[PDB]
C-alpha cells in the first residue's frame, strides 16, 4: 500500500495507547455517592452544577466517588450512566424524611437491581443528643417503642432496609459519628465483599 | 409572578394559533412525491452493487 | 386575572386543536395505500469499529461521508476512517461522562458534552499537529444532551435544564436562548437549510425553533412519554420523533400535526435513535431491545431488522450520501451496515 | 511558533563521520514523522532518510543505505559515516504526519551547509527555466515514469516552492489539494502520469524554483526543478 | 493366565464376574454422562475465563464418554478387540488423555475459584479471554503430549485366544503409566484440598457465611472435593495394593491376583462416575 501504511501505523499506535489507558483505568473502583442535601457526603469527603468526582487511594485500590447530587435535572435520564458502578454509597443524616423515598427510588431502579448499596447513618452523636429532647414519633409517627438510641437507630435502619425487594443485592449499613475516620476501612471491607460475591457469581458458583 | 408566566404562555399560544395550515392531503402527497423523485438515488432501498459500493 | 389568562389559554388550545382537526381531511396511509412496498430491505455489517472500551453514547458522520466521530463513557472521542476502519484521532476528554458529540460540516471542529453542563469545541486542524480544545462553552444549568454545528463559528445545544441555546463559538457566549419546554430537551435536529430546528423534550412534545429570531414557531404533541430522538425528513418539511413509549411518529410542519405512527405489538422497548435514508423512504430507528428496525416511512410497516448488537443501541446515523448507516451500542462496538 | 532548526555543518575530511542534529519546538514532535532532504550546492533536492513516529520503520536512499542512520527531548539526529566527496549538500529537516486528510511535508527546516574536502520512480520536469513577468500566468509541468494514481483513488504528486535564499515550502499536496496558508492563485492539474501546477495572476513573491515529488513508494524522487525567473 | 510383553512377564485375567456386574453400570454411566454433558455443551455453545475452563472440562468428559461405547463393545465381547491395531492405539490414547484432562481442568477450576475468593484483587481475576484461551490451549497441549507417547506402541496384544486392547497389565517392571496415574490423583487432590480449605476459611472468617448464597457456595465447594475423592480414590488404592503385592511377593505365581484385578477393573468405573456426576459443577448451585 501507499502512505496508507503510515496511516495504519498511526492507527495501530493510538490503538495501543487506548488499550494501555484501558488497562491502567481498569484498576479503579467506581462508587456512586448519594443522599439528601447536607446529609454528610461532604463531611466524609473532607474526612477522607455539574458532576463532582472525589478520589482516594486505600490499600492499593483507587476508589472514585461521584457526588452526582449536584445535577439539577431528572435522574432517570442520566442515572443509567452509573449502571456499572461497583457499589452505591447512600448517606443519611440521623439528626434531620424524603431520604427514604429517594432510597426506595434508587435501590429499586431498573439499572440497579443488581448493585448493592452501602448505607451510612451519619450524625450519630447529634442524633443521640436530639433523642434526649424529642422521640422518633415526630419523624416516624408509627414508631411504638422506648426512646432509646439502641432501639430508635435500629428502627430507622430497619425502615431503610425494608425498601429492597430484589434478593440479588445486599445493604451494608454502618453508623458514623462524623468524628471517626474509619469510613475508608468500612468502604474497603464492603467493596471487597461485593467484589468476591461478584467473582463467585462470575464463576457460576454464587 | 404567575400572572407574567400565564401572559407569556397565552402570548405563545396566540402567536402559534395564527400559523397558516395546509391540508394533510397536500403535505402527504408532497412527501410521497419527494420520496418517489429521489428513489433512484437511495443506495439503502435500492441495493448497491459491490462494483461501486465503497464498503465492499 | 390568573383565571382569565388560564381560561383564554385553554380556549386557544381548543382553537388550535379544532384547526388541526379541520386540516386533517385525510391520512398518509389512506393516500400511500397504492404505493408499492419496498420489500425486505436487508443489509449486512460491512465494518465493525472496535476500540471503545465502554458504552458508546453518540456517533456523528462528517459531511465528507467517510470520517465518523464516536464518543464513549471511557473518556475518549475517536475519529474513525470508516472505509478502512483506521482510527484517525483519539481525543482524551476532560471528563468521562459524555452524552453527545458532533462533527462540524467543514470537518475542522468536533464538539462534545455531557453531565459537565459544558460543551467543548475541539480543533482538528491545529498547526501544532495535536488536537486541542478551542473553546469550552459553559452556561447551562443541566447536562447537555445534544449539540449540532450550524457552521464553524456557531453551534446550537440542548440541555436537561429545559433550554436550547445558540452559541457564538468565536466569543464563547450564548447568542440566543430558546425557552418553552417543561422538561429536559433530550434531542435536537437542525434543518437541512439550518434556518430553523426542532427539539424533542421529556414532556412529550417537540417544538419547532427558528434560529434567527429565537422564538418558538410550532409545537407538536401526541407522544405519551419522553422523546429520546428526533430527525428532520430530508425535504425539511417533516420530522420523525422517537419516544420512550415504544413508538415513533412522523410530523408535518406545514400541516402542523402528526401523519403516521410506527409501532408494533411485539415492541415494548423505547426508541433511542431515529434517522432517515437519503430519499426519506426508509426510517431506521434504534431500540432498547438491542435491535434496530427499518420502517417504510410511507407505508408504516417494517422492512428489516439490523440485529447485530448485544446491548441497546444508543446512536444511529445515515451517511450524508446515504451509502451506509452506522449504529453505536452500549456493547462498545459501532457497526457499519449496507 | 513552529521551528525546525538544525546544527552540525562545516568542513569534514572525506571518509570521516559527523552528527547532524535537528531540534524541533512548538509542535507535537512525537506524533510527527521526520525526513531528511539534502540539496546539492547547485542542483535539486534529494531524499535521504525517513524515520516514522515511534521509530517503527526507517527508510534510506539507495546512495545512503549502510552509511547513514536516523534517530530521534524533541530532537532528530543523522549519524553520517564514511562520507564521500558527493555527500556535500545542505541538509533540511522535514516533518510529516500521515492520516486521512493530512498534509505531509508541510514544514521544512532551515538547513545546515555541509561540505567535504533503477526500479525507483524517476520524475522529470521538461523545462529548466520559464521567464515570466508579474500579472501574467505561468504553468510548470512535471511527469513521472510510473503512474501515481493509486487504486484507492489518490494521486501522490507533491509540489514545492523554494524561493532564493529560503527553504522549500509545500504548495500542492497529492496533486490537487492546496496547502494551508498558500494563496489561492496556485492550482494543481493533471492525472495519471502528467501533472501541472498553474499560477494565475503571478506576483513577484512567487519567483523561485518549483519541485515535483512523488510519495507513492520510497525513495521519494524529486523532479529536476523548474526555475521561474523574473522577466 | 500369563503373558510376556515389553521384555517382561505379565498376567491378566478374564473373569466372568466382570460380565455379571460391570456392563449395566457402564451403560448407565454412559447414558447419564451423555445426557448431562452433551446438554451442557449445547448450552455453552448456544464467555469468561472460568466459563471457558468449565467448557474445557465439559469437552474432556464428553470425549471420554464418546470413547466409552468402544469400551462397551470391548467388554461385551470378552476383551476380543476385533477392531484391531489403529482403533486400539486411538482409543487408549484418547481415553487416557480425556481422564488426565478432566482431572487437570478440575484442578484449574479449583485454582480459579481460590483466586476469585482468597485473592479477589489479584490481577489474575481480570485476565482477558485471550489469555485464558491460550492457557487452556497450552494445558491441552500438556495433556496431549503427556500421553501421545502411548499412541506409538504397536497395539493390540495377543493373550491365548483373546485379542486384548489394554495397558493396565500387571507385571514387575515400571512404565510412566503407573507413576503418573498415581500422581494425577495425589497432587491434584492436594491442590483441590488446599484451595477448598482456603476458600472455606476465607468465607467464614469474613462473617458472610450466614448469607444463604454463601451458605450453599461452601457446601458446593466441599462436595466438589468429596466427589473427586469418591470417584478416584478406590482405583488408586487398589492399584497401590497391586504394587504392594508385586513388590512383596513378585509375579512368580499370579493365582493370588484374580480378586484384586477384578476389584481394579470394577473400581475404574468410578473414574467414569466422575463423568456422570460432572454436572454438579455446571448445573447445580448456579442460577442459569
Ligand atoms: C491407557 C490406560 C488409561 C492406562 C494408562 N494411562 C496412562 C497414562 C499415563 C500418563 C497420563 O498422564 C495419562 N495416562 N498410562 O497407562 C488404560 O489401560 N485404560 C483402560 C481403561 C480406562 O482407563 O478407561 C478402560 C479399560 C482399558 C484400560
Amino acid at each position: 500500500s501507499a502512505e496508507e501504511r503510515a496511516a495504519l501505523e498511526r492507527s495501530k499506535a493510538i490503538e495501543k495507547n487506548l488499550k494501555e489507558d484501558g488497562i491502567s483505568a481498569a484498576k479503579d473502583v467506581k462508587l456512586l455517592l448519594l443522599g439528601a442535601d447536607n446529609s454528610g457526603k461532604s463531611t466524609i469527603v473532607k474526612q477522607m452544577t455539574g458532576i463532582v468526582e472525589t478520589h482516594f487511594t486505600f490499600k492499593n485500590l483507587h476508589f472514585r466517588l461521584f457526588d452526582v447530587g449536584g445535577q439539577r435535572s431528572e435522574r432517570k435520564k442520566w442515572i443509567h450512566c452509573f449502571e456499572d458502578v461497583t457499589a452505591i454509597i447512600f448517606c443519611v443524616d440521623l439528626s434531620d424524611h424524603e431520604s427514604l423515598m429517594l432510597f426506595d427510588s434508587i435501590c429499586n431502579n431498573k439499572f440497579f437491581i443488581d448493585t448493592s448499596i452501602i448505607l451510612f447513618l451519619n450524625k450519630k452523636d447529634l442524633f443521640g443528643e436530639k433523642i434526649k429532647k424529642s422521640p422518633l414519633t415526630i419523624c416516624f409517627p408509627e414508631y411504638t417503642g422506648p426512646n432509646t438510641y439502641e432501639d430508635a437507630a435500629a428502627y430507622i435502619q430497619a425502615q431503610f432496609e425494608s425498601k429492597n425487594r430484589s434478593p440479588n443485592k445486599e445493604i451494608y449499613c454502618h453508623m458514623t459519628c462524623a468524628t471517626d475516620t474509619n469510613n475508608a476501612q468500612v468502604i474497603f471491607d464492603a467493596v471487597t465483599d461485593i467484589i468476591i460475591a461478584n467473582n463467585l457469581r462470575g464463576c457460576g458458583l454464587y | 409572578a404567575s400572572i407574567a408566566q400565564a401572559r407569556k404562555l397565552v402570548e405563545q399560544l396566540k402567536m402559534e394559533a395564527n400559523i397558516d395550515r395546509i391540508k394533510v392531503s397536500k403535505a402527504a402527497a408532497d412527501l410521497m412525491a419527494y420520496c418517489e423523485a429521489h428513489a433512484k438515488e437511495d443506495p439503502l432501498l435500492t441495493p448497491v452493487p459491490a462494483s461501486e459500493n465503497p464498503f465492499r | 386575572e390568573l383565571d382569565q389568562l388560564r381560561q383564554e389559554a385553554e380556549q386557544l388550545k381548543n382553537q388550535i386543536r379544532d384547526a388541526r382537526k379541520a386540516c386533517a381531511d385525510a391520512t398518509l396511509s389512506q393516500i400511500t395505500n397504492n404505493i408499492d412496498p419496498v420489500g425486505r430491505i436487508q443489509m449486512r455489517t460491512r465494518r465493525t469499529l472496535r476500540g471503545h472500551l465502554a458504552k458508546i453514547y453518540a456517533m456523528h458522520w462528517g459531511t465528507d461521508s467517510r470520517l465518523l466521530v464516536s464518543a464513549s463513557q471511557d473518556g475518549k472521542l475517536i475519529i474513525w476512517d470508516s472505509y478502512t476502519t483506521n482510527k484517525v484521532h483519539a481525543i482524551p476528554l476532560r471528563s468521562s461522562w459524555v452524552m453527545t458529540c458532533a462533527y462540524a460540516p467543514s470537518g475542522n471542529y468536533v464538539a462534545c458534552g455531557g453531565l459537565d453542563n459544558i460543551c467543548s469545541i475541539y480543533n482538528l486542524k491545529t498547526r501544532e499537529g495535536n488536537v486541542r480544545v478551542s473553546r469550552e462553552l459553559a452556561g447551562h444549568t443541566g447536562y447537555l444532551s445534544c449539540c449540532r454545528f450550524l457552521d464553524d463559528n456557531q453551534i446550537v445545544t440542548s440541555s436537561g435544564d429545559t433550554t436550547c441555546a445558540l452559541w457564538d463559538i468565536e466569543t464563547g457566549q450564548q447568542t440566543t436562548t430558546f425557552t418553552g419546554h417543561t422538561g429536559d430537551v433530550m434531542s435536537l435536529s437542525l434543518a437541512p437549510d439550518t434556518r430553523l430546528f426542532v427539539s424533542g423534550a421529556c414532556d412529550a412534545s417537540a417544538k419547532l425553533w427558528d434560529v434567527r429570531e429565537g422564538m418558538c414557531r410550532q409545537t407538536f404533541t401526541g407522544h405519551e412519554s419522553d422523546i429520546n430522538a428526533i430527525c428532520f425528513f430530508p425535504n425539511g418539511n417533516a420530522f420523525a420523533t422517537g419516544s420512550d413509549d415504544a413508538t415513533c411518529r412522523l410530523f408535518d410542519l406545514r400541516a402542523d400535526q402528526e401523519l403516521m405512527t410506527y409501532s408494533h405489538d411485539n415492541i415494548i422497548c423505547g426508541i433511542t435513535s431515529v434517522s432517515f435514508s437519503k430519499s426519506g423512504r426508509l426510517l431506521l430507528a434504534g431500540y432498547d431491545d438491542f435491535n434496530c428496525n427499518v420502517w417504510d416511512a410511507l407505508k408504516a410497516d417494517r422492512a428489516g431488522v439490523l440485529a447485530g448488537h448485544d446491548n441497546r443501541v444508543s446512536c444511529l446515523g445515515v451517511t450524508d450520501d446515504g451509502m451506509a448507516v452506522a449504529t453505536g451500542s452500549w456493547d462498545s462496538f459501532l457497526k457499519i451496515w449496507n | 511558533d513552529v521551528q525546525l532548526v538544525e546544527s552540525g555543518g562545516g568542513l569534514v575530511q572525506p571518509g570521516g563521520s559527523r552528527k547532524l542534529s535537528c531540534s524541533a519546538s512548538g509542535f507535537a514532535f512525537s506524533s510527527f514523522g521526520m525526513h531528511w532532504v539534502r540539496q546539492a550546492p547547485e542542483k535539486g533536492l534529494e531524499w535521504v532518510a525517513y524515520i516514522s513516529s515511534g521509530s517503527g520503520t526507517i527508510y534510506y536512499a539507495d546512495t545512503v543505505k549502510g552509511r547513514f542512520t536516523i534517530s530521534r527531548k524533541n530532537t532528530l539526529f543523522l549519524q553520517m559515516t564514511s562520507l564521500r566527496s558527493e555527500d556535500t549538500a545542505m541538509y533540511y529537516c522535514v516533518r510529516s504526519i500521515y492520516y486521512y486528510g493530512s498534509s505531509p511535508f508541510d514544514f521544512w527546516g532551515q538547513g545546515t551547509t555541509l561540505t567535504v574536502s533503477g526500479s525507483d520512480i524517476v520524475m522529470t520536469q521538461a523545462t529548466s527555466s520559464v521567464p515570466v513577468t508579474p500579472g501574467e500566468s505561468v504553468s510548470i509541468s512535471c511527469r513521472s515514469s510510473k503512474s501515481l494514481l493509486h487504486s484507492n483513488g489518490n494521486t501522490y504528486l507533491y509540489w514545492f516552492l523554494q524561493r532564493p535564499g529560503q527553504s522549500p515550502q509545500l504548495l500542492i499536496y497529492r496533486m490537487s489539494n492546496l496547502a494551508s496558508g498558500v494563496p489561492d492563485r496556485f492550482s494543481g492539474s493533471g492525472s495519471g502520469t502528467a501533472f501541472t501546477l498553474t499560477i494565475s495572476r503571478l506576483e513577484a513573491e512567487d519567483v523561485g524554483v518549483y519541485y515535483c515529488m512523488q510519495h507513492l513508494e520510497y525513495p521519494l524522487t524529486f523532479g529536476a526543478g523548474t526555475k521561474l525567473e523574473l522577466k | 493366565h500369563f503373558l510376556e510383553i515389553d521384555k517382561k512377564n505379565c498376567c491378566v485375567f478374564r473373569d466372568d464376574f466382570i460380565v455379571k456386574v460391570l456392563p449395566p453400570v457402564l451403560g448407565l454411566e454412559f447414558i447419564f454422562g451423555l445426557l448431562g454433558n452433551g446438554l451442557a455443551l449445547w448450552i455453552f455453545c448456544f464467555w469468561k475465563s472460568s466459563r471457558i475452563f468449565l467448557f474445557n472440562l465439559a469437552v474432556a468428559d464428553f470425549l471420554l464418554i464418546i470413547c466409552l461405547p468402544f469400551l462397551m463393545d470391548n467388554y461385551v465381547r470378552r476383551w476380543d478387540w476385533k477392531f484391531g491395531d489403529i482403533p486400539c492405539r486411538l482409543m487408549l490414547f484418547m481415553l487416557a488423555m480425556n481422564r488426565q484432562g478432566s482431572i487437570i481442568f478440575l484442578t484449574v477450576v479449583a485454582v480459579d475459584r481460590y483466586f476469585r475468593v482468597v485473592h479477589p484483587h489479584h490481577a489474575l481475576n481480570k485476565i482477558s479471554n485471550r489469555t485464558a484461551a491460550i492457557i487452556s490451549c497450552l494445558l491441552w497441549g500438556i495433556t496431549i503430549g503427556l500421553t501421545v507417547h502411548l499412541l506409538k506402541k504397536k497395539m493390540p496384544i495377543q493373550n491365548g485366544g483373546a485379542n486384548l486392547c489394554s495397558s493396565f497389565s500387571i507385571c514387575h517392571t515400571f512404565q510412566w503409566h503407573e507413576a503418573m496415574f498415581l500422581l494425577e490423583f495425589f497432587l491434584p487432590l492436594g491442590i483441590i484440598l488446599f484451595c477448598s480449605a482456603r476458600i472455606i476459611w476465607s468465607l467464614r472468617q469474613r462473617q458472610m457465611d450466614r448469607h444463604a448464597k454463601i451458605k450453599r457456595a461452601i457446601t458446593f465447594i466441599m462436595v466438589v472435593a468429596i466427589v473427586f475423592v469418591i470417584c478416584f480414590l478406590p482405583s488408586v488404592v487398589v492399584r497401590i495394593r497391586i504394587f504392594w503385592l508385586l513388590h512383596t511377593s513378585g509375579t512368580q505365581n499370579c493365582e493370588v491376583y484374580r480378586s484384586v484385578d477384578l476389584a481394579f477393573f470394577i473400581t475404574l468405573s468410578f473414574t467414569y462416575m466422575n463423568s456422570m456426576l460432572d454436572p454438579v459443577v455446571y448445573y447445580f448451585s448456579s442460577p442459569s
Side-chain angles (χ1 to χ4, degrees), chain A residues 1-3 5-14 16-19 21-23 25-27 29-36 39-45 48-71 73-92 94 98-100 102-113 115-116 118-123 125-131 134-135 137-149 151-161 163-165 167 169-175 178 182-197 199-206, chain B residues 1-6 9-14 16-18 21-39 41-55, chain C residues 2 5 8-9 11 13-16 19 22 24-33 35-39 42-48 50-58 60-62 64-67 69 71 73 75-76 80-93 95-125 127 129-131 133-135 137-143 145-168 171-184 187-189 191-194 196-214 216-225 227-234 236-240 242 246-251 253-257 259 261-268 270-273 275-283 285-287 290-309 311 313 315 317-333 336-338, chain D residues 1-12 14-19 21-33 35-41 44-45 47-61 63-64 66 68-69 71-72 74-75 77-84 87-89 91-118 120-135 137 139 141-148 150-156 158-168 170 172-174 176-184 186 188-196 198-200 202-204 207-216 218-226 229-230, chain E residues 2 10-11 13 19 22-24 27 30 33 36 38 40 48-61 63-64 68-72 74-75 79 81 84 87-88 91-125 127 129 131-134 136-137 139-141 143-145 147 149 151 155-157 159-162 165-168 170-173 177 179-183 185-200 202-203 205-206 208-209 211-214 216-221 223-236 238-239 241-243 245-246 249-250 254 257 260-269 271-272 274 277-283 286-288:
Chain A
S1 304
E3 77 186 49
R5 280 181 275 151
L8 177 60
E9 271 205 70
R10 179 181 165 92
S11 169
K12 287 279 186 271
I14 74 185
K16 193 194 301 181
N17 209 335
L18 264 57
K19 118 195 180 316
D21 213 18
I23 284 168
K27 333 301 191 63
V29 180
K30 304 172 151 323
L31 294 164
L32 178 66
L33 176 57
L34 297 178
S39 34
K41 303 181 293 170
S42 34
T43 292
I44 80 173
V45 161
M48 328 156 39
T49 44
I51 192 185
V52 176
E53 176 182 340
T54 294
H55 82 67
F56 77 99
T57 325
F58 187 88
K59 295 183 177 177
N60 294 347
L61 292 182
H62 184 211
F63 292 105
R64 298 176 68 199
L65 301 160
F66 302 112
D67 183 18
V68 80
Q71 269 296 332
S73 64
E74 179 24 69
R75 277 51 181 149
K76 64 182 311 293
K77 293 301 186 189
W78 54 251
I79 201 66
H80 63 77
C81 294
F82 306 102
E83 76 172 339
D84 52 52
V85 300
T86 291
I88 294 161
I89 296 170
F90 198 91
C91 287
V92 172
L94 295 180
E98 84 202 33
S99 303
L100 279 92
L102 176 33
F103 178 46
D104 172 349
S105 147
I106 183 59
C107 171
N108 304 7
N109 188 292
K110 159 182 21 174
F111 301 109
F112 297 138
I113 58 184
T115 286
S116 100
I118 299 164
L119 179 69
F120 282 98
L121 306 186
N122 294 314
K123 314 298 183 76
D125 292 345
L126 270 274
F127 183 62
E129 183 64 23
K130 185 187 171 188
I131 63 182
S134 106
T137 294
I138 291 66
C139 301
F140 294 98
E142 72 295 20
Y143 180 62
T144 325
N147 155 15
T148 36
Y149 176 24
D151 283 347
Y155 179 78
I156 273 185
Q157 190 184 314
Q159 293 303 40
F160 279 95
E161 301 216 20
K163 301 307 183 186
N164 66 334
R165 294 61 171 271
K169 72 194 291 166
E170 224 198 343
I171 300 208
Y172 299 94
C173 299
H174 192 272
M175 281 213 218
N182 185 17
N183 297 317
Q185 173 64 30
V186 182
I187 295 163
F188 186 50
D189 283 359
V191 166
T192 207
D193 303 358
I194 291 159
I195 280 180
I196 79 174
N199 287 344
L200 285 166
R201 194 201 301 309
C203 69
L205 203 173
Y206 189 89
Chain B
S2 308
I3 302 302
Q5 183 54 99
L9 172 43
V10 73
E11 181 47 0
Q12 163 45 30
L13 286 164
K14 266 134 64 78
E16 177 182 303
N18 284 7
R21 294 181 250 281
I22 89 178
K23 304 262 161 293
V24 165
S25 325
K26 210 214 156 311
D30 273 299
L31 293 174
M32 159 187 45
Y34 184 94
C35 261
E36 166 45 351
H38 289 58
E41 322 181 5
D42 190 312
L44 290 166
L45 72 85
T46 57
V48 59
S51 315
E52 81 206 350
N53 179 5
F55 295 101
Chain C
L2 177 61
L5 294 169
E8 172 66 330
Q11 175 280 34
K13 286 180 177 180
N14 264 337
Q15 203 293 349
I16 281 149
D25 85 9
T27 78
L28 183 61
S29 305
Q30 203 164 80
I31 287 160
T32 63
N33 73 47
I35 293 292
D36 313 278
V38 311
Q42 71 226 331
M43 51 195 98
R44 307 197 311 103
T45 294
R46 305 306 175 156
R47 305 289 186 270
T48 305
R50 307 177 192 273
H52 284 297
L53 310 162
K55 298 194 278 163
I56 293 170
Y57 286 98
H60 197 247
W61 289 101
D64 64 69
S65 161
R66 180 168 173 170
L67 293 174
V69 67
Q73 93 184 20
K76 324 282 281 183
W80 308 90
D81 173 14
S82 67
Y83 284 11
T84 71
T85 307
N86 281 308
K87 292 170 282 284
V88 175
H89 296 106
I91 302 169
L93 302 180
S95 171
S96 325
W97 302 110
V98 53
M99 283 195 84
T100 194
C101 67
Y103 215 130
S106 68
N108 294 323
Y109 298 91
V110 154
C112 180
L115 308 186
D116 310 334
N117 314 337
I118 289 171
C119 178
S120 298
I121 310 301
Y122 294 90
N123 179 2
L124 305 185
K125 305 303 186 69
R127 183 63 173 178
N130 54 7
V131 180
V133 177
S134 69
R135 314 281 310 111
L137 304 174
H140 291 296
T141 309
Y143 66 96
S145 57
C146 192
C147 63
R148 291 295 174 246
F149 287 85
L150 311 187
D151 73 79
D152 289 7
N153 195 147
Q154 65 199 325
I155 179 166
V156 66
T157 64
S158 60
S159 325
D161 79 272
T162 82
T163 325
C164 302
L166 173 69
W167 303 83
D168 174 67
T171 55
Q173 213 54 30
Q174 295 185 349
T175 290
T176 279
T177 206
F178 306 98
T179 52
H181 292 301
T182 279
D184 309 27
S187 72
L188 179 146
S189 182
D193 67 17
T194 72
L196 76 180
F197 77 96
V198 292
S199 60
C202 292
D203 60 319
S205 74
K207 275 180 159 63
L208 179 80
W209 300 110
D210 170 333
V211 172
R212 310 304 175 197
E213 325 96 340
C216 189
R217 191 167 301 297
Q218 294 177 314
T219 195
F220 301 92
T221 192
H223 279 295
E224 304 187 3
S225 205
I227 298 184
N228 291 333
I230 202 166
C231 186
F232 264 99
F233 177 91
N237 288 322
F239 70 92
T247 180
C248 54
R249 298 173 191 267
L250 184 85
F251 297 99
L253 301 196
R254 304 191 281 151
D256 197 16
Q257 68 199 128
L259 291 179
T261 300
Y262 311 106
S263 172
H264 212 180
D265 299 350
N266 59 265
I267 288 174
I268 40 153
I271 314 302
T272 56
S273 325
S275 194
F276 284 94
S277 196
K278 154 172 271 293
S279 65
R281 183 58 186 278
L282 302 179
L283 195 185
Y287 291 70
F290 313 169
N291 288 355
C292 160
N293 290 269
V294 180
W295 294 93
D296 180 329
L298 296 188
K299 299 304 306 292
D301 54 22
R302 282 161 59 187
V305 191
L306 312 164
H309 296 284
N311 210 332
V313 283
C315 43
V318 180
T319 56
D320 188 59
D321 71 15
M323 201 55 88
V325 60
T327 57
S329 147
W330 290 8
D331 70 359
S332 78
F333 303 123
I336 310 300
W337 306 80
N338 195 20
Chain D
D1 231 344
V2 174
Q3 303 264 350
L4 287 164
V5 293
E6 324 94 10
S7 60
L11 271 283
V12 284
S17 172
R18 164 131 301 181
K19 168 74 90 71
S21 34
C22 173
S23 176
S25 67
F27 75 92
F29 177 86
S30 181
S31 70
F32 282 74
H35 307 243
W36 286 90
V37 175
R38 78 180 180 186
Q39 183 163 23
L45 309 182
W47 173 73
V48 173
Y50 164 60
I51 179 158
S52 158
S53 173
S55 310
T57 88
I58 304 178
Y59 298 81
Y60 301 95
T63 64
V64 160
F68 301 173
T69 190
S71 61
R72 77 208 315 253
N74 305 334
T75 56
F77 312 125
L78 193 68
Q79 262 304 130
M80 321 165 48
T81 75
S82 307
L83 297 184
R84 304 141 201 91
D87 286 319
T88 176
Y91 285 71
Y92 303 105
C93 182
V94 183
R95 81 181 195 170
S96 64
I97 194 166
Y98 301 98
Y99 56 85
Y100 178 72
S102 63
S103 180
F105 287 71
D106 36 45
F107 191 67
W108 291 57
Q110 273 313 340
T112 88
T113 181
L114 184 149
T115 175
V116 303
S117 306
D120 72 5
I121 306 182
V122 85
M123 295 203 29
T124 62
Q125 296 194 0
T127 298
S128 74
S129 91
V130 179
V132 73
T133 59
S137 303
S139 177
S141 61
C142 173
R143 303 187 69 101
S144 57
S145 60
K146 177 158 56 180
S147 180
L148 306 187
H150 189 267
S151 303
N152 73 43
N154 290 291
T155 167
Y156 295 105
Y158 289 69
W159 286 87
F160 301 101
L161 174 99
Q162 175 167 47
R163 298 183 185 83
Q166 189 171 88
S167 65
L170 179 77
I172 304 294
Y173 61 100
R174 293 187 294 270
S176 62
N177 297 104
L178 186 69
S180 184
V182 179
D184 186 314
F186 294 95
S189 324
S191 64
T193 278
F195 312 97
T196 287
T198 302
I199 314 175
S200 301
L202 180 146
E203 51 285 359
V207 152
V209 185
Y210 294 71
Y211 305 103
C212 58
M213 182 198 78
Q214 65 92 3
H215 209 308
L216 191 73
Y218 302 98
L220 309 177
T221 326
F222 292 77
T226 295
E229 69 179 316
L230 190 62
Chain E
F2 187 82
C10 301
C11 47
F13 300 86
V19 193
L22 186 56
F30 170 55
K48 344 186 197 53
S49 59
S50 51
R51 293 292 191 158
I52 81 165
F53 297 163
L54 263 173
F55 164 90
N56 279 241
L57 197 183
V59 169
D61 269 309
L63 274 48
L64 184 136
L68 242 194
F70 305 138
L71 183 60
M72 220 45 208
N74 182 335
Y75 292 159
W79 276 301
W81 185 262
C88 187
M91 161 155 178
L92 259 51
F93 160 82
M94 212 166 30
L95 199 22
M97 182 284 277
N98 297 162
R99 205 139 55 192
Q100 181 217 331
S102 70
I103 291 174
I104 272 171
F105 284 113
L106 272 171
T107 305
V108 84
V109 165
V111 172
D112 190 52
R113 286 159 154 52
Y114 166 110
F115 269 94
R116 279 182 194 291
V117 188
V118 159
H119 303 301
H121 305 300
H122 189 287
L124 181 57
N125 294 277
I127 63 169
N129 277 25
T131 290
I134 68 173
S136 152
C137 90
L139 258 287
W140 270 128
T143 55
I144 208 90
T147 279
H149 75 289
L151 210 176
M155 311 275 138
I157 291 157
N159 164 286
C165 177
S166 302
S167 178
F168 272 147
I170 318 158
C171 44
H172 250 136
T173 35
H177 295 177
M180 282 215 168
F181 174 76
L182 277 154
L183 83 91
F185 176 70
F186 282 150
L187 179 161
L189 180 63
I191 295 175
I192 286 278
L193 288 176
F194 171 81
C195 291
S196 325
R198 289 296 306 284
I199 299 157
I200 294 287
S202 298
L203 290 163
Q205 112 159 23
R206 284 211 71 90
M208 81 195 97
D209 56 339
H211 303 347
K213 315 282 191 103
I214 314 275
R216 74 171 311 101
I218 42 173
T219 66
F220 247 62
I221 289 179
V223 315
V224 173
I226 299 298
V227 166
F228 185 96
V229 152
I230 158 229
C231 292
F232 291 105
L233 178 63
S235 72
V236 168
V238 152
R239 185 150 201 61
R241 191 180 297 222
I242 291 291
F243 257 113
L245 292 165
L246 184 145
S249 300
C254 293
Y257 274 41
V260 59
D261 184 357
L262 151 73
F264 184 66
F265 283 112
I266 216 154
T267 53
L268 278 164
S269 36
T271 89
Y272 322 129
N274 194 357
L277 298 172
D278 198 22
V280 56
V281 189
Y282 315 134
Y283 298 1
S286 181
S288 305

